[PDB]
Ligand binder design. Structure first.
Ligand SMILES: CCN(C)C(=O)c1cccc(N)c1
Ligand SMILES: [Zn+2]
Ligand SMILES: [Zn+2]
Ligand SMILES: [Zn+2]
Length: 459
């Protein structure tokens, strides 16, 4: 039970306005045949065009919402909309394109999908709210067959070319005209009452309905993301490495250790309240401070209300010492905080668009993150870059240009000249810091934080 059986029933009620007379009793096998595709009894890695909700979740990076609206059915122009915001008009002869024949539309579909997906996934999963026209339009741009590899590399083939009779992955498909072995899922099979807009609007106010196909495609994928990553959360699902995951996560751990260590040295807090992940370890194990942990899993719907996290009767006094909120997203941080908050607006291959302004951050695991909000940081200030170190000035064991920096807080810099070891460590730390910032993480601190207080920690 890993793939979706072609003999599973498909509820057809949502299809009967575009396809009147459609049988109520329908399997995926009969639906695929009706869509103009022939599976030929093939045991070659592609058992069904449609996939399970569990397979869709493992391949969330491949999700592309897709909707087709009858502009005027073999005789009428169709408006093809995608969750990329693209609308194409295909004539049978928010970007809006004029009507063109299928032979040129299919070229655009392949280019659009390849550019969107080459750095995200080895496939495409068309996410539908199936009414009929989208299913019957697939024969005009989709070819199916056995699982194949790219002509130019070892990746699985996602595109086909009728000009050269060859196959390509998303990276090598320039000039290709057919989508090859795509996957799809109909959200209407999950059990909903009412239309797409009424279900989407229950959870999201950011996607409006401009009455175009791409608006529906966007809403469909958003509703699917809400169902699979907001109301349902699965942290047992692992996702492959597609970018800087390892470096970003290592940088996050380095910056956390640096910032907390310096805050403890500068303001000598007697107690630290570490609010967040229940599997957390002390980021500064050698610190004197009374370290107290409070469990809160990453919120995936709305940011935690600080009143619920702290009140209703613990140290009780969160006002004592400092609070560390390392990726624990709250509505309004208290003034005595050290905060790392992911900015959902950041563009990257790890950060996918989400529900209600939120984003789906996929780095080893999938984390739906509530929308970034600047008002959460009103009691704090942005944490400035700095490098602090009390380690001995000693090289041990990469050429050198002397480092001059006001933010290298070391004994050598206090003494007037940065040593080679602390210059190498400063540059490595600055690289880790810039990686984490560009990855989308933002850092905030209590207003009284001042790196000038670190210089006297060397006596
Ligand atoms: C915004 C995602 N959250 C809540 C994290 O804690 C996280 C997840 C994966 C990687 C990293 N570095 C951080
Ligand atoms: Zn390739
Ligand atoms: Zn939405
Ligand atoms: Zn030094």
């Amino acid at each position: 039970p890993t793939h979706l059986s072609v003999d599973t029933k498909f509820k057809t009620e949502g299809l009967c306005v575009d396809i009147p007379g459609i049988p109520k009793d329908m399997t995926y096998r009969r639906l695929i045949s009706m869509m103009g595709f022939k599976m030929n009894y093939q045991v070659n890695g592609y058992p069904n065009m449609f996939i399970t909700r569990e397979e869709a979740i493992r391949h969330v990076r491949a999700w592309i919402g897709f909707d087709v609206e009858g502009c005027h059915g073999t005789n009428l122009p169709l408006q093809l909309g995608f969750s990329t915001g693209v609308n194409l008009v295909a004539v049978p002869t928010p970007l809006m394109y004029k009507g063109l024949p299928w032979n040129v539309v299919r070229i655009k579909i392949v280019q659009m999908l390849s550019d969107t997906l080459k750095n995200l996934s080895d496939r495409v999963v068309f996410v539908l709210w199936a009414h009929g026209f989208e299913l019957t339009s697939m024969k005009y741009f989709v070819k199916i067959g056995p699982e194949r590899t790219c002509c130019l590399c070892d990746r699985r083939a996602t595109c086909f070319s009728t000009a050269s009779d060859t196959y390509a992955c998303w990276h090598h498909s320039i000039g290709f005209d057919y989508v090859y072995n795509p996957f799809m899922i109909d959200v209407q099979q999950w059990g909903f009452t009412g239309n797409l807009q009424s279900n989407h609007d229950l959870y999201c106010q950011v996607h409006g309905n401009a009455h175009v196909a791409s608006c529906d495609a966007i809403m469909t994928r958003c509703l699917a993301v809400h169902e699979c990553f907001v109301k349902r959360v699965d942290w047992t699902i692992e996702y492959p490495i597609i970018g800087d995951e390892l470096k970003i996560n290592a940088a996050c751990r380095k910056v956390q250790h640096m910032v907390v260590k310096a805050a403890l040295l500068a303001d000598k807090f007697p107690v630290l309240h570490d609010i967040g992940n229940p599997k957390a370890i002390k980021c500064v194990p050698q610190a004197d401070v009374e370290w107290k942990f409070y469990d809160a899993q990453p919120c995936s719907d709305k940011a935690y209300k600080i009143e619920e996290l702290f009140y209703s009767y613990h140290s009780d006094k969160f006002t004592d010492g400092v609070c560390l909120f390392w990726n624990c997203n709250v509505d309004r941080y208290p003034a005595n905080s050290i905060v790392c908050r992911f900015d959902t607006r950041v563009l990257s291959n790890l950060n996918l668009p989400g529900c209600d302004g939120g984003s789906l951050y996929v780095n080893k695991h999938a984390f739906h993150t509530p929308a970034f909000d600047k008002s959460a940081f009103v009691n704090l200030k942005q944490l400035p870059f700095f490098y602090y170190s009390d380690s001995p000035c000693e090289s041990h064991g990469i050429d050198y240009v002397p480092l001059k920096s006001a933010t290298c807080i070391t004994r050598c810099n206090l003494g007037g000249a940065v040593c080679r070891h602390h210059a190498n460590e400063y540059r490595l730390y600055l690289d880790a810091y810039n990686m984490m910032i560009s990855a989308g993480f933002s850092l905030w601190v209590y207003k009284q934080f001042d790196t000038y207080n670190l210089w006297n920690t060397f006596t």
